[PDB]
Amino acid sequence: QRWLGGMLTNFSTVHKRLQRLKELEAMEQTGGFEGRTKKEILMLTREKNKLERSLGGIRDMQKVPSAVWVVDTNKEHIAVGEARKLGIPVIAILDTNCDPDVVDYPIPGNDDAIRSAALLTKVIASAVAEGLQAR
Amino acid sequence: GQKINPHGFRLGITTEWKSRWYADKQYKDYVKEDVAIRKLLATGLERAGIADVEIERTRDRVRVDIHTARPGIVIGRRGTEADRIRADLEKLTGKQVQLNILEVKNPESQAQLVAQGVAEQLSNRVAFRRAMRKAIQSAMRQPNVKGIRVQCSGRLGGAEMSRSEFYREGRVPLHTLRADIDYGLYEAKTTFGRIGVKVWIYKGDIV
RNA sequence: AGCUCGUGUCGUGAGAUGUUGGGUUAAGUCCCGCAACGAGCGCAACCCUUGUCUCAUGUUGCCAGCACGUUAUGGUGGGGACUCGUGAGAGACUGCCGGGGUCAACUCGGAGGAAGGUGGGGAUGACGUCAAGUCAUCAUGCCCCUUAUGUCCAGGGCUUCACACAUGCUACAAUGGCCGGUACAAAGGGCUGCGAUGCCGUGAGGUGGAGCGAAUCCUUUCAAAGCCGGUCUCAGUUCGGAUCGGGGUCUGCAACUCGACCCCGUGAAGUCGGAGUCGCUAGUAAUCGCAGAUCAGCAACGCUGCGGUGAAUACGUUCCCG
RNA sequence: CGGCCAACUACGUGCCAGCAGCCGCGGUAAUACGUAGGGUCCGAGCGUUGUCCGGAAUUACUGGGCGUAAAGAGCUCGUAGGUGGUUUGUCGCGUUGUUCGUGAAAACUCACAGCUUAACUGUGGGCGUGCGGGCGAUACGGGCAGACUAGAGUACUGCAGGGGAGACUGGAAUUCCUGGUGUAGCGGUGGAAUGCGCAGAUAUCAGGAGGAACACCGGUGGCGAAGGCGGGUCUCUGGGCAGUAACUGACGCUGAGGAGCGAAAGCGUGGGGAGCGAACAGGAUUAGAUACCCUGGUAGUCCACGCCGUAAACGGUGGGUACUAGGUGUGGGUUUCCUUCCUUGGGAUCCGUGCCGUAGCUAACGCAUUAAGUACCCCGCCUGGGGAGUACGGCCGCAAGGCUAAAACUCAAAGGAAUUGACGGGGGCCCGCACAAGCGGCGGAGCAUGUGGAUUAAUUCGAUGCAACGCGAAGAACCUUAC
């Protein structure tokens, strides 16, 4: 959806969001939708939706990402900058308008096509899948 | 004049009256004897933290209950302290006066005791930042404390210019009626004047 | 309706971002975006009162249906029915419908309802500003007085008056004045206090004391504006009441300085007020009366409340103020 | 004995007495004044004053700068000087190695020795950074004798242009004059009045005279060293660019002084004079208007020939050269390929002129292949702010004045950029009995109450825009009560 500025650098703060999301899932499981005012429960449901929508793959962040795979570094310059600040290696597919000085492991190619980016994601997913196979 | 006294805001809702009796013709003299009792107890005892004094009356017999953080100090092992307070409460024309000395469960969660301690530390030599930080940390360490604000003003540190300083931790919703805000005010005696310490402590809400 | 903080990011740094942008709201209220992610004090809600209904409830409060009443009436035996009093609860949540809307906030209209979109009014006043006010409520550092700047007493003063300013009340009248008759309130107070019937004065009032710690008795059974009738006939007047003369009442040790009220007489300015300026959007303004605190008495026309009768106007933000 | 900068309390005093190198301390509770305790630093010394160096990179050779902080001459040409592409041979001037002579002693430095130690004294080295003579080297600089064509210039072929000077000439409009028509206003402003007209104005038509400036084209477009330059035509004349590379063969760059050009205003002599318009007159506004606004209006603006020599003469950025990512407009010219070859087709290239942006630089703003980046050569200039670009002297000028250019004294700053507020007779969007629409009032009268002022023995004290003034006072005859 959208890169919250400072997931990697401000990790401790954004982990509280996952804690709150889990707390609200527990509240959903127990069924506390009638114990308070309708405005409060409606706002709570909206907060649930916003937090789960903005953080889809973030619920598994235990320590830090050991590497970052990014498409169209120009669009998400904040994420690449955060990795560079933290020193986490970044693997990117760079288009002809990108800067090769910021990525470590470039893969030249197009990112404006859904098919090319999809194929590159297939390749990286195969790599990580086999690596998780060979643990 | 900014904020009304938190106890008086919730007097009929959350907090309770500290004097319990009914009088129609004898309201005025009852009030007089109550304030006399209160000032006597305030002057006589200063070592043990006197958090609260309740007075109950019924015809001849008068029941006064006080809460302190050091009950042993104010009570005589042979009743010597009890003897003195009993006799000089008889002298207050109280007819039959009986005392129920009590102890507070969590001295650090009581606003009056916290303010008393902060002011006592302030009086001798302590820098005010140290006192406020220590009080805030000690109170937040307690289980029920959800928020504490400490504010003291005056010639802090013996300065020529008066200042007001305050630190807060957690939630202190002064405008919320159901929230119970424990309020404590006590004046620190220093060589350069008088320093006033106000403490607000918030511990959940009562519905 | 704003004021900040933690972490992160930008900057050598003061600092910035969040808190900006679009929309929306009474609101930093919310939604969508966004190097920011969250949090705190504020906003809102929780409290009181008021508007509807349900259950409980019958005395000192009601009396519809029954009996006794004597004019004097719930007055009396009786009765929960209707009010009312006070406990609990329900009830308004954009809940529903239709349309705008990013299918989001939000917004317009409709139904139901006593009430519709924070229903009305309260309490609640963020960080701070103005060295704002208060050493005369109180407390307090320092300085000063201490045969006095402490302390007791009598008398006087705080009420002085050529003026100036400010807030009010009463008027300048006929949408009124006077006289007679007559109808409707709420709220509150009362023990060495409220004080009734009766009697005596013209009237303040005097004597007397029934009953009342009071939903019971007293404040009259409570009002005035209101309505009906009569008179006045546009005048400095039957308007207006100041000032002054004489005579009294009450409180109080004592009304000279310096109280209030009553009676007879006196009858001033004042003909709707320049420049300029104030309050108020509905049970409001205007107007009418009632009560309370302080209080022996009162300078109360002040202040804090209560009810009666009850309007006009808002096209719209160019100008004035914040 | 406040901080710099080791070392603090009490008493006395109170914006005084005083202290102080700077910042600055004295306002009944001073670690800054004075005195006592205590302390610290030195010690037969310890402080003050005077003078020099250091700190000061603050005259910067080592070792600074000039867009906005002080600092690029207004711009060119050029003298002396400084500096100079590739290459061959030679000289050994600079440069470099070695050697000899000299560089007195003393001093300094190293070692040793003698005074009981030290200061001091002596001895032996080094030092004496230099100069002179001999000998060696030739990379670099220089000289000499050549060579080359990449710099520089010429030739030829094209090209664009408000580059400049002179002469002649066009039309619109303003003004005026004459003659018709034609009436009672015109003109001007936020609103008016002076003013013009009724003796025929303004308006409209025809004719005539004169001067100045050249709408559209016409722009962040062209040319010029800069100032600057556009109505048309003709004559004379300067520079630039591109291509070919035929020619010469380093002929280059900069340039102290010096010379020339140099907006506007101003000055002299002679013409011209429509419009505009300093000065000057009235009118108006205003408390006052020596102004802004209006009606008039003289120098001047224009031409010829000469002076002057200044400007925010600014890109606030001296000239030459080489190198350092790109993207996109636009002006001039050559060329290959899409090729219709019509077409900004597109590319490449050379010369300009803008915008955006890297690296890098900068205090920041910003600059950024047109540098304020990286370097080399030459020139001008700066050294805290006022006094002052002034006085004195000098030179130039008809004059106005310009150029060169101090000191005394005085201050502890003056400055640049940027941040947060506050403010604006800045902009945008909103609100509130804020205005507008209404109703009732206050300001006039009489009285009540509070306050100021005055008065008194005393009129106790407090409260002074909103947010003091029927406020503290929810009750002053005595009490209250403080006078």
How many Å from the CA of B1 to C1' of D440?
Answer: 36
- B61-94 burial, b at 16+ Cβ within 10 Å, e below that, comes to ebbbbbbbbeeeebbeeeeebeeebeeebeeeeb
Nearest to B181, CA basis, from B41, B5, B44: B5
CA dihedral B201, B202, B203, B207 (to 10 degrees): 140
- Residues 6 or more apart in contact with residue B98 via CB below 8 angstroms: B61, B62, B63, B64
Strands A90-93 and A68-71: parallel
Judge if B16-105 and B106-207 fold alike in CATH terms.
no
Residue with tokens 């990014």: A70
Q: How far apart are CA A64 and CA A83, in angstroms?
A: 11
DSSP state for residue B192 in the 8-state scheme = T
The Cα B23–Cα B19 span in angstroms is: 12
Q: Tally Cβ neighbours within 10 Å of residue B186.
A: 21
Taking the CA of residue B10 and the C1' sugar atom of nucleotide C247, their distance in angstroms comes to 63
Q: Is the CB of A75 under 7 A from strand C?
A: no
CA angle A124, A130, A133 (to 5 degrees): 145
Q: Which method, experimentally, gave rise to this model?
A: cryo-EM
Enclosing H/E stretch for A109? none
CA dihedral sign, ordered B117, B120, B123, B124: negative
The answer as to CATH 3.30.300.20 being correct for domain B16-105 is yes
Contact call for residues B138 and B169 (beta carbons, < 8 A):
no
Three-class DSSP category at B1: coil
The Cα–Cα gap between A52 and B91 comes to 71
Angle (CA) B48-B49-B52 rounded to 5° is 125
| Backbone angle region of A109, left / alpha / beta, with phi > 0 → left and psi within -120 to 50 → alpha | left
- Token pair in block for residue B89: 């409460």
Spell out residues with C-beta < 7 A from strand D.
Answer: B 158, 191-192
Q: Where are the beta strands (DSSP E) in B31-161?
A: 50-58, 61-68, 96-103, 147-154
Coil, strand or helix: which one is A106? strand
As a whole number of angstroms, the distance between CA A116 and CA A120 comes to: 6
CA distance B138 to B123: 19
Q: Is the CB of B43 under 7 A from strand C?
A: no
Q: What are the C-alpha distances in Å from B164 to residues A73, A130, B84, B136, B155?
A: 51, 65, 41, 17, 9
To which residue do tokens 């506390």 refer?
A: A32
* Å: A48 CA to D102 C1': 102
C-alpha to C-alpha distances, A62 to A14, A18, A50, A57, A66, nearest whole angstrom: 11, 10, 21, 12, 11
A13 touches strand C (CB under 7 A): yes
Q: Report chain B's C-alpha Rg in angstroms.
A: 19
- Assign residue A15 the CATH number of its domain: 1.10.287.610
Does residue B7 reach within 7 angstroms of strand C, measured from its CB? no
| Resolution of the coordinates, Å | 2.9
Contacts of B199 (CB under 8 A, 6+ apart): B111, B112, B114, B115, B118, B135, B148, B149, B150, B151, B182, B183, B184, B185
CB atoms within 10 A of CB B41: 18
How far from A112 is each of A3, A52, A69, A94, B37, CA to CA, in Å? 19, 27, 16, 11, 85
What 3-state DSSP class applies to A81? helix
Asked whether the beta carbons of A61 and A22 are under 8 A apart, the reply is no
Among all strands, which nt has the closest C1' to B192 (CA)? C141
Please enumerate in sequence order all residues whose Cβ is within 8 A of that of B191, keeping only pairs 6 or more positions apart, or say none.
B158
Using alpha carbons, select from B136, B127, B128, B66 the residue that is nearest to residue B102.
Answer: B66
How far does the CA of A127 sit from the C1' of D395, in Å? 92
**3 state DSSP class of B17:** coil
CA of A77: nearest nucleotide by C1' is C35
Q: Is the dihedral of CA B40, B46, B48, B54 positive or negative?
A: positive
Matching residue, tokens 């009581």: B110
Residue A72 region by backbone torsions, left for phi larger than 0, else alpha for psi between -120 and 50, else beta? left
Beta-carbon contacts of residue A8 (< 8 Å; ≥ 6 apart): A64, A65, A79, A82, A83, A85, A86, A88
Using a 10 angstrom Cβ sphere, with 0-12 exposed, 13-18 middle and 19 or more buried, the burial of residue B97 is: buried
Q: Among B190, B114, B115, B200, which residue's Cα sits nearest to residue B154?
A: B190
Domain ranges in chain B are: 16-105, 106-207
Nucleotides of C under 7 A from a protein CB: 6-10, 30-47, 93-95, 123-128, 131, 139-142, 191-192, 213
Beta strands in B32-73 (DSSP E): 50-58, 61-68
Q: In whole angstroms, what is the distance from residue B160 CA to residue A76 CA?
A: 56
CA distance B99 to A131: 78
| Gap from B146 CA to D341 C1', Å | 86
What tokens were used for A50? Answer: 């916003």
Integer Cα distance of B123 and B186 in angstroms: 12
Query: How far in angstroms lies nucleotide D253's C1' from the CA of residue B72?
Result: 104
Q: Interior CA angle at B139 toward B136 and B142, to 5°? A: 145
Sheet containing B163-170: which strands, arranged edge to edge?
B163-170, B147-154, B193-205, B179-190
Residue B94 and residue B62 in contact, taking contact as beta carbons nearer than 8 Å? yes
User: 3.40.309.10, 3.30.1140.32, 1.10.10.60, 3.30.930.10: which CATH number matches B106-207?
Assistant: 3.30.1140.32
Span CA (A105) to C1' (D96), Å: 57
Q: CA-CA-CA-CA torsion for B135, B138, B140, B142, nearest 10 degrees? A: -140
Give the range of the structural domain holding residue A13, as residue numbers without chain letter: 4-55
Please list the alpha-helical segments (H only) found in A10-113. 11-30, 38-54, 77-86
Closest nucleotide to residue A20 (Cα to C1')?
Answer: C38
Distance B145 CA to D408 C1' (A): 78
Q: What's the Å distance between residue A8 CA and nucleotide D293 C1'?
A: 69
Asked whether residue A116, judged by its CB, lies under 7 Å from any atom of the DNA or RNA strand C, the reply is no
Q: Using DSSP, state whether B21 is helix, strand or coil.
A: coil
CA B47 vs. chain centroid, Å, equals 13
